[PDB]
Amino acid sequence: LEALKSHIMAAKAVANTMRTSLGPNGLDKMMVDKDGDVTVTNDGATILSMMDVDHQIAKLMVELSKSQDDEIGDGTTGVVVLAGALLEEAEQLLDRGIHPIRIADGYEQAARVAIERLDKISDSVLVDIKDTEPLIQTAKSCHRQMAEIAVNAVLTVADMERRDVDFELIKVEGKVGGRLEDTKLIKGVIVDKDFSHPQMPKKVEDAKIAILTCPFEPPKPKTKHKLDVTSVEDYKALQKYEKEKFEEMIQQIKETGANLAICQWGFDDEANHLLLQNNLPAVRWVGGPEIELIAIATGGRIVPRFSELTAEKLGFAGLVQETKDKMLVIEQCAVTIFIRGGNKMIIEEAKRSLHDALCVIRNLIRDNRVVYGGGAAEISCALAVSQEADKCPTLEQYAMRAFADALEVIPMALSENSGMNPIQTMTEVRARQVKEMNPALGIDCLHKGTNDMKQQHVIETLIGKKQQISLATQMVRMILKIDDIRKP
Amino acid sequence: LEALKSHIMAAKAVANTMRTSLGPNGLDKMMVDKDGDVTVTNDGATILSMMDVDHQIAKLMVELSKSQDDEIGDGTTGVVVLAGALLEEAEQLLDRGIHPIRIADGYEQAARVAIERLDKISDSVLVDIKDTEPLIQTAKSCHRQMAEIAVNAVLTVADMERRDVDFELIKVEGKVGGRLEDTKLIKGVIVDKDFSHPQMPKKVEDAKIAILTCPFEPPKPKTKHKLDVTSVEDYKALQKYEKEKFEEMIQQIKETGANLAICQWGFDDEANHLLLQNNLPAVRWVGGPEIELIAIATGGRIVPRFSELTAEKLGFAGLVQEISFGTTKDKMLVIEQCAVTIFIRGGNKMIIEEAKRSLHDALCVIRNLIRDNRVVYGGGAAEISCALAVSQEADKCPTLEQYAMRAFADALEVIPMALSENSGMNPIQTMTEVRARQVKEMNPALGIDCLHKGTNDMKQQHVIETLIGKKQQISLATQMVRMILKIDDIRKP
Amino acid sequence: LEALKSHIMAAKAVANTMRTSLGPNGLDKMMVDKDGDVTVTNDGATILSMMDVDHQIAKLMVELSKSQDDEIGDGTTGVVVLAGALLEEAEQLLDRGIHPIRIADGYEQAARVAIERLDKISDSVLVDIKDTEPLIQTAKSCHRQMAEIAVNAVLTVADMERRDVDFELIKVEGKVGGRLEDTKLIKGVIVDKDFSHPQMPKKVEDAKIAILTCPFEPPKPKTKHKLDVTSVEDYKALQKYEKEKFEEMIQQIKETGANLAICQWGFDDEANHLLLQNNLPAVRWVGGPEIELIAIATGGRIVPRFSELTAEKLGFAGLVQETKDKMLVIEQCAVTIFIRGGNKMIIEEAKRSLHDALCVIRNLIRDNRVVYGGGAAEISCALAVSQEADKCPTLEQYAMRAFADALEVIPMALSENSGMNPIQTMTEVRARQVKEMNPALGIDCLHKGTNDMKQQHVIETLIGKKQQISLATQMVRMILKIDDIRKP
Amino acid sequence: MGLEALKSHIMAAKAVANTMRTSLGPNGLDKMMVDKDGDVTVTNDGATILSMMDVDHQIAKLMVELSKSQDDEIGDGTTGVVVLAGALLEEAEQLLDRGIHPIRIADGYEQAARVAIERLDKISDSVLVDIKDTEPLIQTAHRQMAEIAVNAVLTVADMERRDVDFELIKVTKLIKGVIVDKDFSHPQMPKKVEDAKIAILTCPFEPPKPKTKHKLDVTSVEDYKALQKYEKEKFEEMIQQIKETGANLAICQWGFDDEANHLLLQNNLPAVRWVGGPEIELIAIATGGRIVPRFSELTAEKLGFAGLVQEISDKMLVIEQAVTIFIHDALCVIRNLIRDNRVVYGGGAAEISCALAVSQEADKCPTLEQYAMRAFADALEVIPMALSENSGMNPIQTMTEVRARQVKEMNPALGIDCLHKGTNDMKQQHVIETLIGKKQQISLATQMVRMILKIDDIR
Ligand SMILES: Nc1ncnc2c1ncn2[C@@H]1O[C@H](COP(=O)(O)OP(=O)(O)O)[C@@H](O)[C@H]1O
Ligand SMILES: Nc1ncnc2c1ncn2[C@@H]1O[C@H](COP(=O)(O)OP(=O)(O)O)[C@@H](O)[C@H]1O
Ligand SMILES: Nc1ncnc2c1ncn2[C@@H]1O[C@H](COP(=O)(O)OP(=O)(O)O)[C@@H](O)[C@H]1O
Ligand SMILES: Nc1ncnc2c1ncn2[C@@H]1O[C@H](COP(=O)(O)OP(=O)(O)O)[C@@H](O)[C@H]1O
Ligand SMILES: [Mg+2]
Ligand SMILES: [Mg+2]
Ligand SMILES: [Mg+2]
């Protein structure tokens, strides 16, 4: 049986590692690590992205933590903290003599209760005309225009009518240099890597693009091959040969519309020369990522060849201009935002913040409902779970109450990270929720305010919490049922 | 003799490992493998499929567990648990002074008794109209459409008139991403991979398929060559040659009907080039399986050549498509000459692999029912009544087989006991009370809830294990115990 | 002197290993072993076939155990058990002060006595019209038709007139799948490996076969060789060359009669193509074993060439047909039986049983005499040996009595394997043989019957026992004389 | 430890049971058994074995005195008690592993014991009393032994009724009372002490040394001879004290020696010396006589009324206020027959019929006690098996065939020959275990197993 307690202990370790980074006052960690740079961040989603590999059960949790929440929802730290708490209680319930399967079934019952109780606390947010602008400022002073950019980005490209699914279709590329919120919103894709030769004309109008992934030397189907190159004459004949078929690539592209092209893999030495004369010149190269962006945005049917391009495909951009990066306007349609800043730390922080923003909006587009955070929704869920537990017989009663006390960890953790007395403030808030009948208040947490939390606008959406609880109960289910730990 | 006790101890060790995974409340076993991912499942069939292969007796239990039950029936974990119990009892019989061959004889006779008793407990199930669907709910809250697609799958592909033996020509593919209720109704066979090339036609309709196991390169003498190209003109002569002989095979396929082709082995550098320019979207590349699927489904008469074919061979498919799931892509085709294949999108990566085994249980169950339509009620009930009959026959038998029969009777009762402990109930208390409620109520159905919700009657909850599942379970268990009870010295050079 | 006791001990070890697998209730062992499959069987003949190599003297026994009995007779387990017993007695006789050479000479005397006494117990079995059918059912419910198949197989192909020697000429090939005794008897050879291409016509009538072992590329007598393949023209000229000489193999075969051929070694890629057009197509390949079967059955003079075939040889089969194996009928003459079953364990068990059958019949054809088994013949032999020992003086007296007590191990072992008290039942049977004067009864052994053993039809033939005793005394002779154990 | 200490006690006790499992029945093994500087003692009958051996585990010592203080002091058969206890524990192990609580197993063993005990009433066979029959009934334990034992226990018995007595017997001739060795010391004394008042004194005979700084100093004749004379007079004090309360002979431990024994002759006080507990408490329980810790301070009262005391070449006393044999086994058996005159046939037969009863009654039982009773049946069946293997027969074979012949022939008698010569009927050979022997055996074994089952932790 102690195999279960080994799993429960190793998982509680991960939880205690992560519960210090919960909330706005969370901590950062270090991570590095492949002789490379460092990353200091809250938001456990990127914390789990590294996390040295040790115990098998811990990695079961690391896989399932990203599995749904980080990939679809937002809140990741909460999943692992809640899971660890549920395990902390399942320990003292296992000691009391209850069988694990009974613990898991009880946690299922309680989970369904809390989820069914998040709908009663829910609040609605409408779409299609701003109003989500003030809903984003919560996701992070500098928020007012960032919200504008976010909504304007997601609403322009979204299924929305109807289906209620986004695309993305959207990444972000920041330039070190500028000042904070001088960031700009665009309508089309933007890439780095310039024209490959300085003498090219900037500004290519109504451009017909040529997306190709091929090398530039004509190959031969593989035979024993070798060569002879006997007389110097044949040497010059060979040079002349591929020098001819370098043009066979140039005007062949120009027959289907030229302007500028786009190449992957290699771009030869004198190729840029022969391409400069014909006003074709492309770019090299940045593969798949940033290639498929231009593929979906304009045209484009990426061509793996090598002389087989016929249009048909490609097109149709209207502007391509600039000190090292080239950016393009007027597309066939596709948005990829742009960010200013300085010191390299003013950017990449706003990228994390933005990520939070886009995620929130997408979730609202799918289902537009919100519950109020700061542990308030957790507390009320615990009230309902405990209430249903008082009316339930047999052993699942105790497992349900354990679920309640486990949910009450989020207010406690939020309190610890801000320096408040955990159980004291947590208890006071639970009391103030029973009376007042206000499932909105709890954990300031910013040390400034009236604690109402309906103010301060702290929203955790709705699918975010239902996915957090569902994933947590799913994990704890596995960990409770895992034994033997085979492995070769 | 102690070699036998070593075998009995190791075998009971395997059994004790998997007696916690018995029933719906069974446990998981982490089970990582090689340099790859992990797999956590109940249903010992996969457990035995990997496990830790060490002792030759454990190897024997894997050998025979997959030999018959996993390949034909369904229940595997029960076989190893029952064999373990029979061994645990036969050990004390060894100590009692009984010869092993006599214990195996008694176990054989008792096994025949129980087997013959399952027929008396049997019940009938109708066929051909919506009657098996509600009885698939035992194999697994997504059941409502799972059972539906199950019966549809096995009834669409079956001998059925009559002979009542059919399997395979049906596979399952999970593409990972969605929720379990996103599972869809199915039509024809569906495979992965791609036609290659992005400029390919992504939807080829009314396709005549050409299935080939051949390389696409023009062959060479394979004598000892030193091919040395002299003049640059001969460089171009080489390129021209293979550029032409790659095409000599293209319109060779197009003269017998083209659309799209199908290739094993290599699809060369240019090749796909020359096939795009000639508008022949072939595909590459897949081994025996998934080749013979499209072979039997449409057409197809797999061609071992290589420029030699007349069609004839090509099949008649109505639609072939390429759909992109997330980033990666799989090409799936509909409207075949007929052959159906199921599809699952579960999400979370672990929500699938559950639906695959749970569905497999469905195909197996329905297949067994078509072969012989009879059911005994599960939850250990059939085991309890079988133990009752075995003890009854044992009280009236003299000499040494008497003791072996009683040991068999007590060994059957481990299934209700394991089912009891895995659900949190007192193992011997509930099992005993049920064994009394089966003689007093004369109802060979009730016993071990086991879901901790219900009337314990087991007539409701409709838990069915068919018949050949149980008959093969007991036959395989007694076969294992028979072999293990013999065998000494374990040479192992 | 203790070198002798080391040999005697190491040999007694092998004996004790084997005496549990004696009789119908014998045990199985495991064997495996080269990262391969397992084999669980009675009949020590296949047990000695593996048996890890340890002591030199043990391997002297393993070589001599197969030397004659398994290769010609049947009973192998009895040889090693009897040898071990003779050694067990030779130990206590060596301690008594008798020289080994005297022990061996006494064992010779006693062996000659017992052998000379097996003729008095002998019984005759006639040949040429069934009657051997009920003689086979003893060799293993399912026996009635198997006996039919066995006699019908051996009598059709045997010298028999006269010479009294078989051939074999006969193997067995079973197909997993079927039901038990649905096995069939044929008149001709049968092989696997199909026609090598599906488009061939099944059923090749009055076929003229072409048995060849050669590769298909024309070689050159070895010189420094190399090549040049300069111009593409010469490349195509080379391809054309061997493409021509591939036909030079085809119609060359068709000139001497074609139908189907048979090839060993490799069969090239496009060779099956060029052979499909000309209605020649052969098979690849399964070497010597199953090749020489068709050689002796039809024709065939296996040709190692490579263009030198002229007929003369080859011929003359009448049918070749079928889901993976091809079988042929109507030959020039040659029998190889066929077996149904299921689970892979229903077959290969009947193969072992069959092996026993064929061996018995062959032995009867050589010399048609039988003694009754179950240890009865052993007991009576012990009675005669002890009787001659009471009238013999000097030291060989004790060695002879030791031979008697050593023969009496077979009834004891047979008793142990069935669970009876060894010395009690053995003694009772010896008594019941002295009175009643019936050298037929002893050791049930099936726990069901009247113990008469003239019933139950338990026959061990005659050469089987005389060879068992001769081989046993031969072994014990060596082991008794071996000393020094040189070795590099 | 908490629980595994239970399995440890099972192992430790069944170790003892397996030690003495070979010494059961007539073909038992003798066990060398020396003792320190002592000699060899080779016998069956574990009764004397349990006295020896060693204190290994406190449960192994708990096996003793439960198998001794009762069955050796009440019944006769000791080895069966420990063998049975070991078997019961062995099956209780399988019941423990099955998930059954220990106290439930102990209770089940109690109820099963009730079934078996109450049977023995049904298997029983009565024997007549008051003459003969008992004599030919003793040849089991060569002719006169029956007679002398019969009349010896006949002379000392309650008989009307309650039927109990022991211990007035110990150790070929007949006997008139209890007898002692040694002499009255100094044969000039009278050998005819008839109508003797015995003065039982376990004490020294010395001048009462005062308590003060002592160190005597003496100079030859004057003081020395006065010292000898002094303690001789002080000896006459005790002499004249014993004659004032009572008369004639006395009995003394410790020292006499010196002249001393001379003086008592001149005063006609033929005492005896010297012996410890035995032969002191023997004549104490026989005649009179209590015990005096003094040393001249007593009232009588105490003295015994022995009628005759004589000396023959060992002095013996007759007619006591008690008869003892002169040259074990049947003497206890007869006592049991005096208590209850019924017998059941032995050789494991009573165990087999009891097992058939406990199992027949166990088939109809709810809850867990079912398995406990069945285990009890399989426990009683170890006596026929052990009996079988000790003679060389196949254990389970002979045992099973007999258990079948008992229900088919309806004969709670036949089973285990065992001497390899007989008709197996057990009616002949006249092998009888009485009733109190078996009933006490089962009660004691079950008491043991229950005790061990309750115990846990225990240091
Ligand atoms: N202004 C705020 N006041 C109180 N709590 C907050 C506030 N903003 C965020 N939180 C809390 O922080 C918790 C976790 O968010 P975060 O630390 O970003 O990690 P994750 O989003 O991965 O859980 C949420 O449960 C939320 O209640
Ligand atoms: N709803 C149920 N109630 C009671 N027992 C069940 C139920 N479903 C399955 N079982 C039991 O589970 C046992 C084994 O099934 P499982 O644990 O899936 O492995 P396997 O099928 O390989 O033996 C069966 O003997 C059956 O009696
Ligand atoms: N039906 C039978 N009853 C009694 N003994 C038998 C019977 N069949 C075979 N045997 C005995 O089995 C012995 C050995 O046969 P087997 O175990 O096959 O090994 P091997 O033939 O190599 O000695 C023979 O000596 C024979 O007496
Ligand atoms: N003649 C006999 N035949 C069969 N069994 C006997 C015979 N005499 C004694 N026994 C058995 O021996 C058993 C034990 O006696 P024993 O070994 O002397 O030691 P104890 O009497 O102390 O147990 C008794 O249970 C009795 O049944
Ligand atoms: Mg957050
Ligand atoms: Mg299952
Ligand atoms: Mg044989």
Author numbering:
A (entry chain B), C (entry chain B): 31 to 170, 180 to 361, 367 to 377, 382 to 536
B (entry chain A): 31 to 170, 180 to 377, 382 to 536
D (entry chain D): 29 to 169, 182 to 211, 222 to 363, 369 to 376, 382 to 387, 403 to 534
Copy the relevant paper text:
TRiC interacts with approximately 10% of the entire proteome and its function is absolutely essential for viability of the cell. The general subunit architecture of the CCTs subunits comprise three distinct domains: an equatorial domain that includes the nucleotide-binding site, an apical domain involved in substrate binding, and an intermediate domain that connects the equatorial and apical domains via two hinge regions. The CCT5 homo-oligomeric complex has the two back-to-back rings of eight subunits similar to the full human TRiC complex. Moreover, the human CCT5 homo-oligomeric complex is able to hydrolyze ATP and refold misfolded protein substrates.
A mutation in human CCT5 subunit at position 147 that replaces a histidine with an arginine residue has been implicated in hereditary sensory neuropathy, which is a class of disorder marked by degeneration of the nerve fibers in the sensory periphery neurons. Sergeeva and collaborators showed the CCT5-H147R mutant has reduced folding activity compared to CCT5-WT against human γD-crystallin and actin substrates. However, biochemical analysis of CCT5-H147R showed that it was still able to hydrolyze ATP and also refold protein substrates. The human CCT5 and CCT5-H147R subunits were solved at 3.5 Å and 3.6 Å resolution, respectively. Our crystal structure of the CCT5-H147R mutant shows the same double homo-octameric ring arrangement as CCT5-WT indicating that the mutation does not affect the oligomeric assembly capability of the homo-octameric ring of the CCT5-H147R subunit. The structure also shows that the Arg147 residue is not positioned in a way that would disrupt the inter-ring or intra-ring interfaces, therefore it is unlikely that the mutation would impair the oligomeric assembly of the full TRiC complex containing the CCT5-H147R subunit. In addition, the CCT5-H147R structure was solved in complex with the nucleotide ADP showing the mutant still can bind nucleotide like the wild-type CCT5. The electron density map for CCT5-H147R demonstrates clear density for the side chain of Arg147, and shows that it is positioned to make a hydrogen bond between the NE atom of Arg147 located on helix-5 and the main carbonyl group of Ser428 located at helix-13 of the equatorial domain. Changes in contacts between structural elements in the complex could have an impact on the flexibility within the equatorial domain, thus modulating the function of a particular subunit. Since TRiC is a highly allosteric molecular machine, the CCT5-H147R point mutation could have an impact on the function of the entire complex by changing cooperativity within the complex.
